[PDB]
């Protein structure tokens, strides 16, 4: 957006002062929307010396004479041209500015407007900026952040030593990555994205997107009335082991609940019988194994089973020994169908196999699995969307990096999912998502589309759980999937 | 407001382009408030070459890419600097401008945005401007006027040959006189007044006001619990004649219904008995007359009656012969109490008498009575607020010039009342208002305050009538007064 401001000014000819005025008045309108009538409140506006502080001066000036009290604390050492202009107007309109932050000043205000740093923050916040931000966070006042809560890196969502915790953040043009990834997402509080007059062409030129209800609605496949099961695709799920007998059941039903026509599981005998005892609409094929895990002896049978389906999901509950590794990699090298690759299939995956596949693939790792897959630490891969993009591009796949905010990327387009809650932090949740993705692929969606729709719906289903989210289990999540679809429509 | 724009730019330092941007975005927000989501509508924006057309370009540019279609028809021959700037931005953002108005163009649009002329209109509109405005008025489209409907003189409300009839008018800073007086009030449709960043000091420097609910609430007198009738004042009403026996009854009850403690009427016998037969809480003193009208023989008795009251109302139903003229003028010359002077007392009034009175007066003429009082035509006095101000100042009185919009002035402050409906265009309505004014004066309000509160409440009571307004009578209006007071609170 740094470039979006610049082009809007330099190429389109919009005066910088117009953009800044529209930014500030958007903050005022957003506050009124959340607080109701502003006239009874006393506002403390904390302004830096940059253009964020300039926006702050616009806010402060526009409250003059309309609210109970306004005071600006100016915290910088110099002012950008637009910040100087708007500081000048604020004073001309009768506004009061002080240049020293006094801890007890918080006592006489109701709302703190945080206009210290925006997207121009570079490096750790220290010194008096940090003390001030810490005092605001202990104050219990209503906090409104201009653009991004000060102290959040707008490109990553990381906290730069300390950061403002906002009740309301008003940002301009588009959401920033730091509003979307944690910890930034948490500090942002309620986010409003204000149109401040950038041309819509520049706003739509962005390559990274938040997944919205309207996007998912447009991607849901059509259900022609004169259809039959084959119209809606066929999925094979290769899953399970003597150790992990439940995984296949959750994945299979995941495919059925999103509207797939036929789902077949291949599961080691007698663990295959667990599936049909719970959901008799599944086909659960018994696979004869030596010790309860897939091995190369099952290669030919799984390839045979794959011939009559549209997509294959592999991984959930397979186990991770050497015989599983041999099977997984030889199967994926030979399989000429789209594959959705999860869990233990990721843990044993030879990424050379992905490069050589002619057919597409979706991988669905959590950060632990992604760490192992690229031989990095969890902290280096977590919310690392640039790494995810590089991986997807190099390996010709779609990568779905699961976390509270899920990243979906094919290396050219990256989408962020923010639906869901902590009920999904529990075994079995990922197994469901794997089946949803395979099911949407079988229904005709591209691997990226299927992933986009599935992460959104899987999170939205969790949110529809009636009781406390901590009690949500994967079996309840399945029941909620058709409600999420209905509501989406 | 021409001077308000100038001072805000030249003294306070707000760039003219900022004011113009805020003006245009206010129009967009106002349209959304009235139309809901704008994205399905097609907009035709009619722009003049002045700053009103400049505002229009801002509107048009801000709809680009968000609504179904936008087209600007540019109708001028040159452009002010700010209009040129915003025309330039509109084109840079991809907007289409045509310079010829084609009658059939109206067919492909849903909303017409009228930004042809604002407060800079001088003189009759002719030529192609007039044809265009006439086509818009026959089109049946939704019309939104920027600032003032084009063709209305913003200082008077008169139509300058022809004018746009708007569904919605968005004006900036303060309402204009042309939104408030007819015919302009009618052409304005729904009015919204947008804050575009003028300092509140300049906005409050205005000397002419619309009477609002909040102003009237602040002026209503207090009712101390430990009170008695005398706390709430005493009114004498000198009214009626053998010809007009009902007037005194309506005036008296007008005083009682607004909370006055004691009301006495002086009415020629036996017409005085009509009052108590309808409302026995009135005191209706019989005055012995020779032929059914007040004359000089009743001077001393009325002066005696006046000694024990706080305010005297005179005029309703007196009749207008020479003996009434002698009585009225000698009574007012001698009376050392506030007087409310209405109807036949205005028709015979010697204005020299008003100049010489030490006590205050309120006059309540309709335009016919005002015409006769200053020896001018009805069309010269109607909505002539400058004449009303001059009269009030010269004669040291408050003038209440009744019409659909009522003007209340003491020569320094002028207030406009817009409550009421056509049910008040009926005999007896004015008689009620006269009693309300005297009653509020007796309760301790200044003549200007009492007039302000009374015109507002009298109109608001009319609006509370349950059935069709054309059926409203003065007797029903009385019953509604206490409801209007309750609702005001």
């Amino acid at each position: 957006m740094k470039e979006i401001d610049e082009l809007t000014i330099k190429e389109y000819g919009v005066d910088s002062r117009i953009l800044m005025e529209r930014a500030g008045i958007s903050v005022v309108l957003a506050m009124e929307e959340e607080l109701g009538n502003l006239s009874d409140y006393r506002f403390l506006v904390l302004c830096g010396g940059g253009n964020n502080g300039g926006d702050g001066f616009v806010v402060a000036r526009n409250l003059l004479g309309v609210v109970k009290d306004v005071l600006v604390v100016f915290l910088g050492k110099k002012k950008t041209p637009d910040c100087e202009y708007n500081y000048g107007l604020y004073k001309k309109f009768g506004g009061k500015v002080v240049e020293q932050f006094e801890p007890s000043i918080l006592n006489e205000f109701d709302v703190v407007v945080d206009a210290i740093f925006g997207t121009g923050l570079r490096g750790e916040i220290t010194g008096e900026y940090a003390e001030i931000i810490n005092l605001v966070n202990k104050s219990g006042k209503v906090v409104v952040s201009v653009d991004v809560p000060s102290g959040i890196d707008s490109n990553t969502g990381k906290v730069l030593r300390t950061a403002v915790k906002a009740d309301l953040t008003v940002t301009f043009g588009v959401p920033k990555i730091g509003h979307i990834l944690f910890p930034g997402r948490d500090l942002t509080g309620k986010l409003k994205v204000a149109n401040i007059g950038h041309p819509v062409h520049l706003i739509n030129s962005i390559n990274r997107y938040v997944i919205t209800r309207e996007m998912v609605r447009s991607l849901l496949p059509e259900r022609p009335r004169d259809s039959h099961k084959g119209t809606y695709g066929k999925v094979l799920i290769i899953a399970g082991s003597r150790l992990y007998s439940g995984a296949p059941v959750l994945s299979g039903m995941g495919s059925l609940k999103v509207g797939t026509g036929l789902v077949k599981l291949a599961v080691p005998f007698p663990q295959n019988l667990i599936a049909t005892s719970r959901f008799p609409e599944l086909i659960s094929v018994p696979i004869d194994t030596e010790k309860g895990f897939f091995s190369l002896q099952n290669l030919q049978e799984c390839l045979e089973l794959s011939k009559d389906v549209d997509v294959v999901a592999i991984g959930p509950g397979l186990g991770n020994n050497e015989h599983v590794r041999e099977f997984v990699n030889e199967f994926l090298k030979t399989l000429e169908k789209p594959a959705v690759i999860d869990a233990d299939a990721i843990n044993v995956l030879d990424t050379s196999v992905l490069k050589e596949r002619k057919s597409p693939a979706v991988l669905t790792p959590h950060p632990g699995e992604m760490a192992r897959l690229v031989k990095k630490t969890v902290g280096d891969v977590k919310y690392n969307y640039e790494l995810a993009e590089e991986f997807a591009k190099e390996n010709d796949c779609v990568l779905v990096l699961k976390s509270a905010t899920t990243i979906v990327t094919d290396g050219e387009k990256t989408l962020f999912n923010i639906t869901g809650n902590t009920g999904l932090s529990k075994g079995g949740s990922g197994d469901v998502l794997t089946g949803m993705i395979a099911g949407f692929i079988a229904q005709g969606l591209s691997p990226l589309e299927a992933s986009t729709v599935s992460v959104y719906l899987h999170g939205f289903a969790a949110e529809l759980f009636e009781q406390d989210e901590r009690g949500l289990t994967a079996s309840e999540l399945l029941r909620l999937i058709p409600e999420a679809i209905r509501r989406l429509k | 407001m021409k001077e308000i724009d100038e001072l805000t730019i030249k003294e306070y330092g707000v760039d003219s382009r900022i004011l113009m941007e805020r003006a245009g975005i206010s129009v967009v927000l106002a349209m959304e408030e009235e139309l809901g989501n704008l994205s399905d509508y097609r907009f035709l924006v009619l722009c003049g070459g002045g700053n009103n057309g400049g505002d229009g370009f801002v509107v048009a540019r801000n709809l680009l890419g968000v609504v179904k279609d936008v087209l600007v028809v540019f109708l001028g021959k040159k452009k002010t600097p700010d209009c040129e700037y915003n025309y330039g931005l509109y084109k840079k953002f991809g907007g289409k401008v045509v310079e010829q108005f084609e009658p059939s163009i109206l067919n492909e649009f849903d909303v017409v945005v009228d930004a042809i002329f604002g407060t800079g209109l001088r003189g009759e509109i002719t030529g192609e401007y007039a044809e265009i405005i006439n086509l818009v008025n026959k089109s049946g489209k939704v019309v939104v006027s920027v600032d003032v409907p084009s063709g209305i003189d913003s200082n008077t409300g008169k139509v300058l040959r022809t004018a746009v009839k708007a569904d919605l008018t968005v004006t900036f800073g303060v309402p204009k006189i042309g939104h408030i007086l007819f015919p302009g009030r009618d052409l304005t449709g729904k009015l919204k007044v947008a804050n575009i960043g003028h300092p509140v000091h300049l906005i409050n420097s205005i000397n002419r006001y619309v009477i609002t609910r909040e102003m009237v609430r602040s002026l209503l007198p207090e009712r101390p619990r430990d009170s008695h009738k005398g706390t709430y004042g005493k009114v004498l009403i000198i009214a009626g004649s053998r010809l007009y026996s009902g007037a005194p009854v309506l005036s008296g009850m007008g005083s009682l219904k607004v909370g006055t403690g004691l009301v006495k009427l002086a009415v020629p016998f036996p017409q005085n008995l009509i009052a108590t037969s309808r409302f026995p809480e009135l005191i209706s003193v019989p005055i012995d007359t020779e032929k059914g009208f007040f004359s000089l023989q009743n001077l001393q008795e009325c002066l005696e009656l006046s000694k024990d009251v706080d305010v005297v109302a005179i005029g309703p139903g007196l009749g207008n012969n020479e003996h009434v003229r002698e009585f009225v003028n000698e009574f007012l010359k001698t009376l050392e109490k506030p007087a409310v002077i209405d109807a036949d007392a205005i028709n015979v009034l010697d204005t020299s008498v008003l100049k010489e009175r030490k006590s205050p007066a309120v006059l309540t003429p309709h335009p016919g009575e005002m015409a006769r009082l200053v020896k001018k035509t009805v069309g010269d006095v109607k909505y002539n607020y400058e004449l009303a101000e001059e009269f009030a100042k010269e004669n040291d009185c408050v003038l209440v010039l009744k019409s659909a919009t009522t003007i209340v002035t003491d020569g320094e402050k002028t207030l406009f009342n817009i409550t009421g409906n056509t049910g008040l265009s009926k005999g007896g309505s004015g008689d009620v208002l006269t009693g309300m004014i005297a009653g509020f004066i007796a309760q301790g309000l200044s003549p200007l305050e009492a007039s302000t509160v009374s015109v507002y409440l009298h109109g608001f009571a009319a609006e509370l009538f349950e059935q069709d307004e054309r059926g409203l009578t003065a007797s029903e209006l009385l019953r509604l007064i206490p409801e209007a007071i309750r609702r005001l609170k």
Binding site: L29, L38 | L29, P175, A194, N195
Partner: peptide, 7 residues
């Protein structure tokens, strides 16, 4: 309710 518009 009224920072931007008077009714």
């Amino acid at each position: 309710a009224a920072w931007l518009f008077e009714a």
